Amino acid sequence: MNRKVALEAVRVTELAALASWSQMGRGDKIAADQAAVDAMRKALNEVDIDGTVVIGEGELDEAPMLYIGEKVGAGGCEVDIALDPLEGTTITSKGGANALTVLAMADKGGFLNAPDVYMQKIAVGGINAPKGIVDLDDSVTNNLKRIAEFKGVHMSALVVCTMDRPRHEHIIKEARECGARVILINDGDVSGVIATATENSGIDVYIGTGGAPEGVLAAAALKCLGGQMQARLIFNDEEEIKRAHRLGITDLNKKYDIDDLASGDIVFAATGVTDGNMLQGVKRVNSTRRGSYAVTHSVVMRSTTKTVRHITAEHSFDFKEGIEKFMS
Amino acid sequence: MNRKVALEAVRVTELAALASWSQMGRGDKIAADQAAVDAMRKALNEVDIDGTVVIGEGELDEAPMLYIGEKVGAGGCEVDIALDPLEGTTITSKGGANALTVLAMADKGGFLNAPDVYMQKIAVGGINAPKGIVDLDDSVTNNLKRIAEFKGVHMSALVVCTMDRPRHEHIIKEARECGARVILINDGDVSGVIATATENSGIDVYIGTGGAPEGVLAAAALKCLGGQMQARLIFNDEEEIKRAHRLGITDLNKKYDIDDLASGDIVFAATGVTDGNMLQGVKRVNSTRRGSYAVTHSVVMRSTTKTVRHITAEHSFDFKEGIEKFMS
Amino acid sequence: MNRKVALEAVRVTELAALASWSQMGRGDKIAADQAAVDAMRKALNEVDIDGTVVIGEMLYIGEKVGAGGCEVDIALDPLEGTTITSKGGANALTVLAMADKGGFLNAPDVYMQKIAVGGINAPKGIVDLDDSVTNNLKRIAEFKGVHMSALVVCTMDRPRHEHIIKEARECGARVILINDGDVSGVIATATENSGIDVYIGTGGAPEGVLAAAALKCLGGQMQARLIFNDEEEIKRAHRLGITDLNKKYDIDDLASGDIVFAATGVTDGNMLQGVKRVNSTRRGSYAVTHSVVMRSTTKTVRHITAEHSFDFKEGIEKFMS
Amino acid sequence: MNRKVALEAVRVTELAALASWSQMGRGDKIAADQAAVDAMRKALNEVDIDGTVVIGEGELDEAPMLYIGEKVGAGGCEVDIALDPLEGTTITSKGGANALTVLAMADKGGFLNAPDVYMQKIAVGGINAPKGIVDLDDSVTNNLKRIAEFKGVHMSALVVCTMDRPRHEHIIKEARECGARVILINDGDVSGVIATATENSGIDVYIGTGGAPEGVLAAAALKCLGGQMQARLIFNDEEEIKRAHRLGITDLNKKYDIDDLASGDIVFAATGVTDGNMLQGVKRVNSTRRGSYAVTHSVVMRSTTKTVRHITAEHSFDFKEGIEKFMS
Ligand SMILES: [Mn+2]
Ligand SMILES: [Mn+2]
Ligand SMILES: [Mn+2]
Ligand SMILES: [Mn+2]
Question: Is the Cβ pair A153, B284 closer than 8 Å?
């Protein structure tokens, strides 16, 4: 995987973010999603890779663009592509927190090719955090006690993050019972997991159930940032089992370690759409010095080197024109 | 008012925010509110003012501490005091966005002594925005068209903020219909209005109904930051009408200009509790160089000088102790 | 001292910095110092203290300042870097420190040998002026957990520092030079992302006390020794109560008890950013100052970015008092 | 040029800056220079370009690596390359301000092929600045009067930067006489010129004489950032004249507009070595969340799109090992 591919990925997430931002607060999640898919597909076909989508918008049946197996790129090293054109379609449509655009790449087979099913998740940051510090079969109490001890703080100092859903009431009750602070996000458990390893996020642990593709994407970032995560797929009906079987997943009760979700040489890239726990959103900026531009905030990271790059980009634009000129 | 009072007010909002933060994500909004009220009252009584609460926790009937009319301070210049010990008690208990502590000071009679009722609000930023650019009796569309013209942008560039409530559906639908982007916050329309005049907030306009005290405090800040706002009190039942009559208000449908909400020499201070669209929340920080601390982010501003100070404070703390040691 | 005094002090350094900035790069050291002194004296006389200048310039030794309050000794520097500000060099600051009566070394205006390192856990003895430069740096490298080659040592670019510079480079350290501003240079050792690990050099005794006051709040260690070259200097020491001429002063001997330290950047430097002209459509035009205020008893540290409204169609000297 | 080349260039300047930093403050300007040359050369040969060095370390006579005419890169689109492995060799050896590493790319013939001679320079930033706002044959006073009018300020507000040299005494004295503020840098007039177009540099104008190669490099950045600049080569002896003649330059007194220095599609990249008035230098950082790393601060920009990216990169490193491990 050529060093060139890493920094090229940020252009993809930036262009998807700008397209998504033009639909921010338009009340239309489908238009938000399609703006991102279109921008990302077009940008990805300029990237010098021999790319196969292993996580994307869906099966070819249901998704015309960025479907599983689709071939993308202008030609280059062979890579598996995990992508999320718009993490937070509903978020973006109402301008909520934590919307992102996300692109990750691995050598062939480096990702768990996750089906569209739910996934139990537990994640903690820290480059020195050991394997086994968290696991999903241990109680919440016992996981937090270990985390607090490793971080060297009282339990009440820890900030635990989960989604505000009925399915999480027991995580929340238990975490609070042993003394921790638990904050709720409305959506965007990609940002919420990655935040555990993000300097100054204010989030120490993530515990929740959400999308499985999102779990792999977040593991890909934690692999570069440092941290630990365990995940397990959930299967509620026979169609979900069939989706897994079609992707080669047959050990349904497997507990996945972070190395099982994303392994080898991983590149992770993301751009903020709205302000979130991980990344700032797109903003309109005026200046006499340079004129008006849209500013994006992005991150690109690589697991092998552990180089993490924070990128602020200034994109020239006349806001006298319609904002949908940021589409494609 | 003696220039000393301005900067002393930040210490008050800081200690109240640290107390609030100890209850963040504990699912107990009464405990968060009380931690805030306690810390803020103890800190005020060390400020060198002869203070009279004109906006606070409530009437002496319902609020034992920081009630309307309470005298606070160690002695000094006579000021009316508008307080919100914790903007976002529910926010704070769940760790939502936009929780703040707030304190504003004016010469005697400078604030609208608002009864505790709903208030319709429209706000826009810009030191050169003219009085009349926004008006509650004009349509959303016409307000937006004027704002867009004044800012020199296409309508679709504008980001309108409002609270996610059924009472705002008509605002949201109309603003989208003429092409604007409308983002929703779950609570905290102090931050929401003030964001219109905060650099890099990504928010251009606020339209919505919320608390009347909060409207006054936001107007206090906008007086210092620059901008325009119009409010109108709303009355649901006859007891609310009596609360207005007791405060001297008989023109129930009076439209208040920003100068009617806050006039004269005004000091506005606020500290973030959680991350919001105005201020960052309190964070736990480690360093070998300094040891561990809590970081607060505050702003204090003054309407006469127009000076705005952004203050990042490092508060030493051993996080092996219980987080509630940050309470007063 | 009443907690009020700390945050009142930043206003003094800010006003002095704005006045200095109006003389930045004008080639007139005298006019810069006079602008700073005026602004500082005027602001100080609104602070609620019974202050006495024990380190100062007019703001002379023994001058009584303040509007009335707790008694404090005042160590001030209306403009650390008059030459600096006049030429637009790096590391010009305005500085105010306050202590309880007798908290500062009452230092004659003489030269002082200095060595300093940052870190709240640094023990007394980590630095010592009578150990070789090499043994000082080996201990600091051990304390910081790094190879010697990682350490960045700061000193002033002066012929009197050639032996320090050569000995530190010989043992493998990286030695960077500043043209002026050893207040900033010393405090940098305890300032996040200054990139300075150690300061070693000779400079003004007043400036050493001021830097020590800050390091007492930020955490670190420093040692100092006064230099006497002329009989006039020795008598200045005697008149101030100093008779042990070769005393090595620890950091607690320079600044003890409850200390407040305030500074504002004039030009960009190793510790603080300088004043800038800013334009915005939302907010209009303003001068931005960058300040720090700190207190030794609580170890609280406040960083303050202040936007001062101003129409830069008018002359800059309107920022004078 | 493929938009892939732009972001690949930052890796080159980052690697050269890290190598330079290992020699910072070691009092050896040659070893600093060689560390940077080595690292830039090696990195450059992994960039997918067919590159020809038009501005480099020297003529092949005197420079073995990165010489004028040298062919570099792994293969791709044809570009002319304007390099400065280490701007501020003496700066770096003393840890002074404004040391940078610099890589610029243009279409064939896009750069003035500058001889190793001195160059008179005047520069101002701002996208709307018209050609003629600055001119080397106008007085200093008249240049500054136009610049004050263009920026909408009193003359006393302007900050004029020059190098602290005897050859600049008349500039310094004239600029001060007409009321401007004139600050002095010891070295580093690449950074000093680009500062005029860099947000928050505090520098409005650069006026001085310095290296002609460094003038082309700074003009390349200003073409991306917006601004105007004029330059004239000066010749002190016969050997300097033939330096020009060898590179095809016989009009010895030509005044070059910025378009004459750098024209067409230009990419410009730089990384700070030491803190300066354009970029921050490399720093050693410790964190518990991430471990220890060297942090670099870079900028990459493009004249056709006007897109500018600020890049903060964290390079994992164990600082118990010798710092010379950052060499190539
Ligand atoms: Mn999605
Ligand atoms: Mn409240
Ligand atoms: Mn002085
Ligand atoms: Mn060079």
Answer: yes
